[PDB]
Amino acid sequence: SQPVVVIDAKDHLLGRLASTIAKQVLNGQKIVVVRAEALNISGEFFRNKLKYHDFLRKATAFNKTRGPFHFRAPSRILYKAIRGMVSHKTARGKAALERLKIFEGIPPPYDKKKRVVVPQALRVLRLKPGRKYTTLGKLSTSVGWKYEDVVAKLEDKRKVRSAEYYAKKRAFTKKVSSASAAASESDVAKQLASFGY
Amino acid sequence: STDSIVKASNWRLVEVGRVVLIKKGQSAGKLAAIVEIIDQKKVLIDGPKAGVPRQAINLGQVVLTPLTFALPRGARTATVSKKWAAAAVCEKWAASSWAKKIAQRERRAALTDFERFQVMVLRKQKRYTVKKALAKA
Amino acid sequence: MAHFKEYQVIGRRLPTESVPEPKLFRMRIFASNEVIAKSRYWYFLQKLHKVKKASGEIVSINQINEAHPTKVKNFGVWVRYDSRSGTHNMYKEIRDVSRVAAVETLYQDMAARHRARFRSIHILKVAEIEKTADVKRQYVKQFLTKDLKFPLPHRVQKSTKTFSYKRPSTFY
Amino acid sequence: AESHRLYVKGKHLSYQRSKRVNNPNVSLIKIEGVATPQDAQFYLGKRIAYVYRASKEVRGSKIRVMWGKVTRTHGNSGVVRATFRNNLPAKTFGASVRIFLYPSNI
Amino acid sequence: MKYIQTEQQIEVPEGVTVSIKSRIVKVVGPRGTLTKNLKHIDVTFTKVNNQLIKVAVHNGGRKHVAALRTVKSLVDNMITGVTKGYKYKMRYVYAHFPINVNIVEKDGAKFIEVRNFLGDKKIRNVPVRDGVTIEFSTNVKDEIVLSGNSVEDVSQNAADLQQICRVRNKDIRKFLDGIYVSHKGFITE
RNA sequence: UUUGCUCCACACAAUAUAGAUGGAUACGAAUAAGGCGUCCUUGUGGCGUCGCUGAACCAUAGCAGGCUAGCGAAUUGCAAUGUCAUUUUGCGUGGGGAUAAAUCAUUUGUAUACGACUUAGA
RNA sequence: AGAACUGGCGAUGCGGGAUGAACCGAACGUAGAGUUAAGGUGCCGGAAUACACGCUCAUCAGACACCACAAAAGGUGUUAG
RNA sequence: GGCCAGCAUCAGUUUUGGUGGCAGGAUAAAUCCAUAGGAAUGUAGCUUGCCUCGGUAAGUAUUAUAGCCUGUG
């Protein structure tokens, strides 16, 4: 029921996350997918590389700028997957893609907000263990994406800030939980805990 | 020999006598006890004081609980109803924080509108003291 | 087809004046209802005796429940079936608690592993194995040892809401 | 207080349709917090309103309302059907409607 | 089908320490320290004792049970190269043209080079892998003894000299010139 | 030639909604594993505890939301938005603020089918 | 290319097979409600990311009869007899 | 005296819940009870070197300081 929903797309399967987003963004929900360089996709590596180099062959013969555009960034591979699952040649589908933004890494507008995770599209719930999967960052940088090292650099410049934030908030709840225990032996806590509270 | 350090897993493992929590179906939410292992997906249960019959339910519909009581494999309803009390299972179950929250989320759903109003006028008081217990910077 | 129910069916050639006491024939048939069971009687009987539905009658059809449906039993199943090229005879083993649950487990186990439908399977003999040396299939022998404890490593929590606000933990 | 709501904000999914054909008399409303057909039986008959904003003022109001009721449940997930008086304009696919509690049986 | 329980046992020798958390095996001992990462296997270790580690698996197939005994042997090769060590004796075979092997420390590290291999004019560089000391047998003029505390970085380096000293466009059964491995022994034996 | 224009302050009118009505409430890594607590020689360390859904947590007592420094709350008749939030754009009111270029015509040839390009000129 | 028996298209829309004269369902006054057929229910797309037991990892996997193809011959791939 | 709504009370068709009474079967089978035999994935006790009163090692021992099956009522 959040207006903007930020999805932590680490360890999500590509086509299963793209199907619970196309159905959600067609119902009027501004969905922001975030750190798509850590998306997963089943099958082993060179099998998925070969399913991409079959896609790179498909271009228009008479003028190759007409045909299918082979976008290489991991945000745009997931955006290729979502756009297949929306009727994007209409005004309903075009408006349903104006409610979707996808980035790789977590940008500064979205680092301070909560990130939610789709349970029916995670790798560790769907894929049977022992299967070989493929991280979308390593796949996309092998077909010509140039800014994997930048996104890995900027993400480490923000993981050390979010760890700095968590240590401040952990020490916050330490001095709150050590203080609220004196406010537990009251009568209102004896009055409220029978109410399921 | 010398010191050796290993930290892998300590699991709730399905064996004879383990208490399970029936989560799906006719006996929903009640406790049971595995009496005989059929195969790696299906088992045989019985809980008398919880009131369930002696089914042969598969493991996709039960949840394993962290407690166990000893009984031989393949015991009957007259046997499991004795060891359920001679090992004191149900009062051990209420002591866990799991069965506290199952009773808590049941109690929260059973309140009417008066004690949906009584909570907020008393949570105003519980909010009032924690700005006087944490009354600092 | 469906959730199986074991019937018995007694049948009889229709009498005539020369022989007004023909012999009764009994079959224990796993089928889904009273109508399919009476059809499977005149299938296996007509492959054994000179009698059709038109020439004979059905004496009695009853249902057979189990005396101990709360006890595991190492079942031993003899079964013939038509492959895509030829006919075979087999012997598997089932573990399940009820005789009709073993036949339900059998038809699933044969339609998966050999692609043999219901129409191309004739069961032969389903018998409880009384002591633990007649069990001769490895995949049943592991459940027949002392102190059978195994864990369930990879638990998944089936969700109701479509989003979650913490990374799920599979621990059991 | 800033507590004012007496409705439940459902979305307007689509018209009642098959593949390749749609029937604009019946619209499918996705109520929030409803996940089964049983407990979508609570909202049957309760009336919806699609409130929207127009530019030309009628009766001294810039907001116009389209009423209608909830008729029967749709398949297996708490979608319900609805029959509005004037049918919803199909520009509102993915637009918040408000299911009230007006004919009440609690 | 899926075997309900499959266990192996790793006997841990004396004075040898083993550290495992989340399928990363750090072994320290009387000579050397080895850290092998095993995240690609579904395997549960358990400390049943201080002298022997039980390694087990649950509900594994034929594929997965086969990949259990390869884990016990990989830990056993870790502790064996930590108690004793590993040494690979390699030997020069040449018909007429002598092979002249040295050790040079270039800009990066101890490259190994061979020269005059079958009269060739191109040097054949091959780096050492670290943890592997390089040794020449002084008494025998045509011998080289690799050695180290891991069997992997020695044998990959021992196969490196076999790969680089190959022949081209000739009968390999006639031109049997090269630098082959003959002995795979331990250090303290 | 204080008519131009820029910005900041209500008095406005006005147009436009792909669709606000409590709160988008922030570690990272791993899942055959972790969170939190707790001391300790500070570790791939002891010890406790927790998960099995966020149905949580935070907020929320009044005329569409008061007060004298305890009173105002009716008849909007039995339901009919029963409203009210924004994004813009012009016009008044006064508080400041800055004081230009481009194109055509003429020219140049590093350019040129025409446009374009590149140059020069108070 | 040619006959026998019926059914259909021609002369016929409709729901399904993405698409199609002939296949599956079913044949038509104009509307409302209800229930289904054939086919379907991750998303495009109305409808279970249902349930249950298995099998399968493919460096050209495989997925809706007519129908848009594949064979002898093989393989200590794995599973079952 | 008109249109348009809302609610009652009905009518026609229908959809979806709650709950009660019976009837049948091996007059359900089971469980539970009663009893008699039996065995093992062997309980007690007992017998062996270890040794934490047999524990863990196995030999007897068929309910004992757990129980299980099968027949019959």
Residues C140 and C79 in one domain: yes
HSE-up (13 A, CA, CB side) for residue A91: 4
Length of chain C: 172
Q: Report the distance separating Cα B56 and Cα B35, nearest Å.
A: 10
Interface membership of C15 toward A (CB under 8 Å): no
Burial of B33 per CB tally in 10 Å (0-12, 13-18, 19+): buried
How many of the other CB atoms lie within 10 Å of CB of C166?
Answer: 8
Q: Is residue C16 part of a domain?
A: yes
Burial of B131 per CB tally in 10 Å (0-12, 13-18, 19+): exposed
* E 21-50 residues inside an 8 A Cβ radius of C: 42, 44
D and B touching (3 or more beta-carbon pairs closer than 8 Å): no
Which nucleotide, over all strands, has the C1' atom closest to the CA of A94?
F18
Name chain C contacts of E5, Cβ cutoff 8 Å: 142, 150
Q: Which of C69, C99, C123 is the last residue of a domain?
A: C69
- The residues near D72 (Cβ < 8 Å, ≥ 6 apart) are D44, D80, D81
Residues C93 and C63 in one domain: no
| Three-state DSSP class for residue D71 | strand
Chains that touch D (3 or more CB pairs under 8 A): A
- Name the closest residue (CA) to the C1' of nucleotide F79: D102
- Please check whether residue E111 is in contact with residue E104, taking contact to mean a CB–CB distance below 8 angstroms: yes
Q: Which of C69, C93, C121 is the last residue of a domain?
A: C69
Residues C60 and C30 in one domain: yes
Q: Where on strand G do bases come within 7 A of a protein Cβ? A: 15-17, 32-34, 41-55, 57-61, 78-81
Residues C122 and C141 in one domain: yes
- Two tokens, residue D103: 């004919």
Pairing status of strand D47-58 against strand D61-73: antiparallel
Which nucleotide, over all strands, has the C1' atom closest to the CA of D71?
H15
| Three-state DSSP class for residue E38 | coil
- Please check whether residue E36 is in contact with residue E25, taking contact to mean a CB–CB distance below 8 angstroms: yes
| Three-state DSSP class for residue C86 | coil
Q: Report the distance separating Cα B106 and Cα B22, nearest Å.
A: 16
Interface membership of B120 toward E (CB under 8 Å): no
How many of the other CB atoms lie within 10 Å of CB of E1?
Answer: 8
Residues C45 and C93 in one domain: no
Name chain A contacts of B123, Cβ cutoff 8 Å: 192, 197
Q: Is residue C114 part of a domain?
A: yes
Q: DSSP per residue over E46-90, as a string?
A: EES-SSEEEEEESSB-HHHHHHHHHHHHHHHHHHHHHHT-EEEEE
Name chain B contacts of A189, Cβ cutoff 8 Å: 126
Q: What is the per-residue burial (b if ≥16 Cβ within 10 Å, else e) of A12-43?
A: bbbebbbbbbbebbbbbbebbbbbbbbbbbbe
Beta-carbon separation of A129 and C154 below 8 A = yes
Interface membership of A154 toward C (CB under 8 Å): no
Nearest to A141 by CA among A42, A43, A36, A8: A36
Beta-carbon separation of B1 and E53 below 8 A = no
- Two tokens, residue B95: 């002591």
From A156's Cα to the closest Cα of chain E, the distance in A is 23
Residues C57 and C85 in one domain: no
Q: Which of C30, C50, C69 is the last residue of a domain?
A: C69
Pairing status of strand A30-34 against strand A4-8: parallel
- Torsion, Cα D19 D29 C160 B61, to 10 degrees, reads -70
- Please check whether residue A39 is in contact with residue A17, taking contact to mean a CB–CB distance below 8 angstroms: yes
From E64's Cα to the closest Cα of chain B, the distance in A is 17
Interface membership of B79 toward C (CB under 8 Å): no
Name chain C contacts of E1, Cβ cutoff 8 Å: 139
CA triple C26-C32-C35, angle to 5 deg = 65
DSSP label at residue C164: B
Q: Report the distance separating Cα D88 and Cα A189, nearest Å.
A: 51
Residues C59 and C79 in one domain: no
Q: Report the distance separating Cα C75 and Cα A57, nearest Å.
A: 57
Helix (H) or strand (E) holding C44: helix C34-44
From E4's Cα to the closest Cα of chain C, the distance in A is 7
Q: Which amino acid is at E120?
A: D
Beta-carbon separation of B8 and E15 below 8 A = no
- The residues near D99 (Cβ < 8 Å, ≥ 6 apart) are D7, D8, D9, D10, D29, D31, D43, D46, D47, D48, D70
Angle between helices A148-180 and B114-133 (to 10 degrees): 90
| Three-state DSSP class for residue B30 | coil
Q: Report the distance separating Cα B100 and Cα C157, nearest Å.
A: 20
DSSP label at residue D7: S
Phi/psi of residue C94, each to 5°?
-120, 160
Q: Report the distance separating Cα E188 and Cα E87, nearest Å.
A: 9
Residue-range definition of the domain harbouring residue C59: 3-69
How many of the other CB atoms lie within 10 Å of CB of D33?
Answer: 10
| Three-state DSSP class for residue C146 | coil
| Three-state DSSP class for residue B35 | strand
Pick the CATH number of D1-106 from 3.40.47.10, 1.25.40.420, 2.40.10.340, 2.40.10.190: 2.40.10.190
Q: DSSP per residue over chain A, as a string?
A: --SEEEEE-TTBBHHHHTHHHHHHHTTS-EEEEE-GGG-EEES-HHHHHHHHHTTTT---SS-TTTS-----SHHHHHHHHHHHTTTTTSHHHHHHSTTEEE-SS--TTSSSS--BB-GGGBHHHHSPTT--EEEHHHHHTTTT---HHHHHHHHHHHHHHHHHHHHHHHHHHHHHHHHHTTTSSSSHHHHHGGGT-
Q: DSSP per residue over D46-61, as a string?
A: PEEEEEEEEEEEETTE
- Two tokens, residue E182: 């003959």
- Enter the CATH code of domain B13-95: 2.30.30.30
For residue A132, the chain E residue with the least C-alpha distance is E40
Q: Is residue C155 part of a domain?
A: no
For residue A133, the chain E residue with the least C-alpha distance is E40
- Please check whether residue B108 is in contact with residue B118, taking contact to mean a CB–CB distance below 8 angstroms: no
Residues C78 and C138 in one domain: yes
Q: Report the distance separating Cα D24 and Cα D46, nearest Å.
A: 20
Total domains, chain C: 2
- Two tokens, residue B24: 């799906």
Q: Where on strand F do bases come within 7 A of a protein Cβ? A: 15-22, 24-34, 36-38, 44-46, 49-62, 64-65, 79-84, 86
Phi/psi of residue A120, each to 5°?
-85, 5
Q: Where are the beta strands (DSSP E) in chain E?
A: 6-11, 17-21, 24-28, 33-37, 44-47, 52-57, 86-93, 100-105, 110-115, 126-127, 132-136, 143-148, 178-185
Name chain B contacts of E44, Cβ cutoff 8 Å: 8-9
Q: Report the distance separating Cα E125 and Cα E157, nearest Å.
A: 12
Burial of D21 per CB tally in 10 Å (0-12, 13-18, 19+): exposed
Name chain E contacts of A130, Cβ cutoff 8 Å: 42, 63-64
From D95's Cα to the closest Cα of chain A, the distance in A is 6
C and A touching (3 or more beta-carbon pairs closer than 8 Å): yes
